[PDB]
From Swiss-Prot, chain A:
N6,N6,N6-trimethyllysine sites (modified residues): 20, 43
Lineage: Eukaryota, Metazoa, Chordata, Craniata, Vertebrata
Transmembrane annotation, as ranges: none
Record organism: Xenopus laevis
Modification N6-succinyllysine occurs at: 20, 43, 86
Protein name listed in UniProt: Histone H3.2
Modified residues (N6-(2-hydroxyisobutyryl)lysine): 20, 28, 43, 86
Phosphothreonine: modified positions: 44, 71
UniProt modified residues of type N6-glutaryllysine: 20, 43, 79, 86
Lipidation (S-palmitoyl cysteine): 74
Entry comment on modification after translation: Acetylation is generally linked to gene activation. Acetylation at Lys-86 (H3K122ac) by EP300/p300 plays a central role in chromatin structure: localizes at the surface of the histone octamer and stimulates transcription, possibly by promoting nucleosome instability. H3R2me2a is present at the 3' of genes regardless of their transcription state and is enriched on inactive promoters, while it is absent on active promoters.
Part of the intact protein present: 38 to 136 of 136
Chain positions with N6-lactoyllysine modification: 20, 43
From Swiss-Prot, chain B:
Cross-link (Glycyl lysine isopeptide (Lys-Gly) (interchain with G-Cter in ubiquitin)): 72
Residues with the N6-glutaryllysine modification: 12, 40, 58, 60, 72
A biological-process GO annotation: nucleosome assembly
GO cellular component: nucleosome; nucleus
Protein's UniProt name: Histone H4
Keywords (A to Z) from UniProt: Acetylation, Chromosome, Citrullination, DNA-binding, Hydroxylation, Isopeptide bond, Methylation, Nucleosome core, Nucleus, Phosphoprotein, Ubl conjugation
Record carries keyword Nucleus: yes
Residue(s) carrying Phosphoserine: 28
Lineage: Eukaryota, Metazoa, Chordata, Craniata, Vertebrata
Modified residues (N6-methyllysine): 1
Protein origin, superkingdom: Eukaryota
Residues of the full protein shown: 21 to 103 of 103
Subcellular location per the Swiss-Prot or TrEMBL entry: Nucleus; Chromosome
Positions carrying N6,N6,N6-trimethyllysine: 1
Length: 99, 83, 56
DNA sequence: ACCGAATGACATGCATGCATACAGGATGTATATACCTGACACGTGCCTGGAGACTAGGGAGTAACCCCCTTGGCGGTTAAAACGCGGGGGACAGC
DNA sequence: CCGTCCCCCGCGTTTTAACCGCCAAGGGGATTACCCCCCAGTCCCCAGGCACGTGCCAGATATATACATCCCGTACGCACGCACATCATTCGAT
């Protein structure tokens, strides 16, 4: 009885929404708390200039999007629509970032 | 009977050999047309750089150096012919 | 110059990076020059593949 | 071969499946509206680095020679290419 | 999963054109020799640029509303099958 959108149509709304805007996507505070954790063993007691914690965010996210875009052809090239883990292993392989 | 656009001088069996070396098992019939495109793109660039040095260096002879360098710019260094 | 057109063509008179990426990605001659960079705060080009559209 | 009565055939009604245009309904989006202000664009020093003039001497552009190695040509074999085809299994489509 | 069919492929002719080997010439790479004009370098001088504040501005940021869009149900068409009566045909006597 209650109205429901069909599956998939809500996504297309976002694809036209998030591709329009230009703010960040990953939650800020955890993403910094990751960079300290991962950087913890390269050196002791590192202090990131807070200008350069976002500078990763605007430089790693413009890399994931450069990935999800690029698998999306491959999942399309395999007659499918959904991306699957088997897709990325290809996608990083042509570039040369895993092999 | 050789007077034609020499791009067909890269004959179809030659194309087949490469794909074998590349590990290709079954080659479609249409690949023989698009490959002559790709190779026509690639040499369009590398010679474009290659002449520029020579035209610069007052040399009317494109030399082995002035193609090792041009390959270096594309991020494909070519060991062996100089350096 | 190309950026200035796009921002005015989005009714905004001051260039902001989202107005600045459109002038390099959409300009085919420059896109081969900034092919590696990733302009900060840049947004991305609006593009949905044809297969992605609904059935109708 | 037609009347006579029964019956398969011819034509249709009936009912339904299906398609579908749409309107309703809701949702969402875009508009034009207010308010607000970090944050732009000069302004104003204020200074050091760009500008003027000066010499000085390599370093590049000249001419002049050479030679080598590229391009040209030119017969021979023979290897690889161009061509046919026979058929199967790899794509393709559908459920 | 079913199953389809065609379209590449081996494999076999036969045309050829790379392949070499050699011959020939000189264009032209490469090198020497000269020299000048040209950039480095110093000294001096100065306005062009950066730092600092400043406000104002419009630029942004939020409102509310009109409008557009999607989706389901709907009904409506419609061609359908089913089903019928009737048009038509057949078996018997005429």
């Amino acid at each position: 009885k209650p109205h429901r959108y069909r599956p998939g149509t809500v996504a297309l709304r976002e694809i036209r929404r998030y591709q329009k805007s230009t703010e960040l996507l990953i939650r800020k505070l955890p993403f910094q708390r990751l960079v300290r954790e991962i950087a913890q063993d390269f050196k002791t007691d590192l202090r990131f200039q807070s200008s350069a914690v976002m500078a990763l965010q605007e430089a790693s996210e413009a890399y994931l999007v450069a990935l999800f875009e690029d698998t999306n052809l491959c999942a399309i090239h395999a007659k499918r629509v959904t991306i699957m883990p088997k897709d990325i292993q290809l996608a990083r392989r042509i570039r040369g970032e895993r092999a | 009977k050789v007077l034609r656009d020499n791009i067909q001088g890269i004959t179809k069996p030659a194309i087949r050999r490469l794909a074998r070396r590349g590990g290709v098992k079954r080659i479609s019939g249409l690949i023989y047309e698009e490959t002559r495109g790709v190779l026509k793109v690639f040499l369009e660039n590398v010679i474009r750089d290659a002449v520029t040095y020579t035209e610069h260096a007052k040399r009317k002879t494109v030399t082995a150096m002035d193609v090792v360098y041009a390959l270096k710019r594309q991020g494909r260094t070519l060991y062996g012919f100089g350096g | 110059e190309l950026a200035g057109n796009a921002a005015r063509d989005n009714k905004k008179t001051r260039i902001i990076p989202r107005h600045l990426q459109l002038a390099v990605r959409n300009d085919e001659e420059l896109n081969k020059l900034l092919g590696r960079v990733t302009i900060a705060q840049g947004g991305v080009l609006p593009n949905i593949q044809s297969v992605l559209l609904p059935k109708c």
